[PDB]
Amino acid sequence: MINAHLLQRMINASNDGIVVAEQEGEDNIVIYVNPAFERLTGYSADEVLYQDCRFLQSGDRDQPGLEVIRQALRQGRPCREVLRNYRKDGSHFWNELSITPVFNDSDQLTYFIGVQKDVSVQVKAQQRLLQLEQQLAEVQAELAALKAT
Amino acid sequence: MINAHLLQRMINASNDGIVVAEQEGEDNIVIYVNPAFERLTGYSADEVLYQDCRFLQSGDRDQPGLEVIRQALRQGRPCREVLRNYRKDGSHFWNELSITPVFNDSDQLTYFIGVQKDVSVQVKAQQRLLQLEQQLAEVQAELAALKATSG
Ligand SMILES: Cc1cc2nc3c(=O)[nH]c(=O)nc-3n(C[C@H](O)[C@H](O)[C@H](O)COP(=O)(O)O)c2cc1C
Ligand SMILES: Cc1cc2nc3c(=O)[nH]c(=O)nc-3n(C[C@H](O)[C@H](O)[C@H](O)COP(=O)(O)O)c2cc1C
Numbered sequence: 001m002i003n004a005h006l007l008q009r010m011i012n013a014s015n016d017g018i019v020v021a022e023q024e025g026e027d028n029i030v031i032y033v034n035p036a037f038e039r040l041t042g043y044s045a046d047e048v049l050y051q052d053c054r055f056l057q058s059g060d061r062d063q064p065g066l067e068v069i070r071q072a073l074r075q076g077r078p079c080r081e082v083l084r085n086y087r088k089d090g091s092h093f094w095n096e097l098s099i100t101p102v103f104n105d106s107d108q109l110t111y112f113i114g115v116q117k118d119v120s121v122q123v124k125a126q127q128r129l130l131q132l133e134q135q136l137a138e139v140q141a142e143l144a145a146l147k148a149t
Numbered sequence: 150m151i152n153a154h155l156l157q158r159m160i161n162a163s164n165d166g167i168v169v170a171e172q173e174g175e176d177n178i179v180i181y182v183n184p185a186f187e188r189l190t191g192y193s194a195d196e197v198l199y200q201d202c203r204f205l206q207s208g209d210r211d212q213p214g215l216e217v218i219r220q221a222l223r224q225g226r227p228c229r230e231v232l233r234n235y236r237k238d239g240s241h242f243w244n245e246l247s248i249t250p251v252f253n254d255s256d257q258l259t260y261f262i263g264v265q266k267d268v269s270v271q272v273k274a275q276q277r278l279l280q281l282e283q284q285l286a287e288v289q290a291e292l293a294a295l296k297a298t299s300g
């Protein structure tokens with residue numbers, strides 16, 4: 001019970017970035033990008049159109065989530081993986097990418113919808129957390145050893 | 150250059166929740182909710198529809214960000230604040246709410262779009278981080294004291 005322009009003004013208001021691609025060959029050529037995508041990646045919507053997103057891995061290919069995504073795109077199944085991507089200015093950021101296949105009610109053929117969340121904050125937090133836990137364990141072990149004497 | 154049901158399948162695929170409300174009086178009655186909202190809040194979409202979202206603050210109406218939102222609702226300007234909300238089962242979760250106004254081709258229109266992000270995970274980390282940092286400091290002090298009496 002809502003208007004189309006309302007749906008569009010919703011998609012503009014998204015925090016996480018959103019992309020829509022047609023599986024046209026081995027690549028997934030992008031036919032739409034929302035403004036949040038432009039803001040996160042720094043890439044202009046006109047720059048991205050009719051291409052595959054693999055360019056966000058500017059030199060950091062071979063991350064295993066890529067193979068996971070390959071399998072998910074082959075089987076027509078959704079997926080969610082964390083990658084290291086690179087903006088226009090080369091800024092490295094962590095990207096929780098969630099891909100959903102979309103079939104039509106008249107045909108079990110596909111469109112792919114991608115959603116990118118900048119987990120960079122969260123990831124740095126987790127890494128720091130693990131480092132600090134290691135440190136704590138270290139100090140506690142040495143204190144126990146000394147206490148033994 | 151894309152289809153309408155395509156936009157609908159897009160908004161359904163969102164991780165963060167999305168709500169659309171018409172500013173009707175003091176309340177902001179919601180006319181639409183996306184599935185991410187149902188999943189995050191646990192409330193049934195049919196229960197929420199012709200009501201206002203203030204029910205998510207099950208008594209925790211003393212959070213100050215609310216006043217900010219009130220002012221933002223008065224002047225028709227966007228806003229974003231973090232609140233502690235409560236699902237149907239009462240489980241407390243942290244909610245980054247982002248509100249954007251939407252006007253008609255006549256500048257005087259009343260639509261509000263809300264976006265809810267579940268920051269709970271991040272928040273717990275920070276809390277654990279602080280707590281954990283405390284623990285480390287404690288141990289580091291005691292290990293010094295013993296060594297101070299060993300040589
Ligand atoms: C809809 C969609 C969005 C994607 N978004 C990203 C992205 O933001 N960053 C990224 O590194 N890969 C993204 N990918 C993955 C690449 O397009 C590509 O599928 C992946 O790198 C594996 O393909 P390849 O082995 O040919 O490189 C996306 C894929 C799809 C289908
Ligand atoms: C679109 C929209 C979404 C909202 N979502 C939430 C929410 O998820 N949680 C919450 O505590 N308040 C939310 N609010 C705020 C309440 O609806 C209400 O405006 C706020 O509590 C202040 O109004 P009050 O002082 O009358 O309670 C939302 C408001 C709008 C307009």
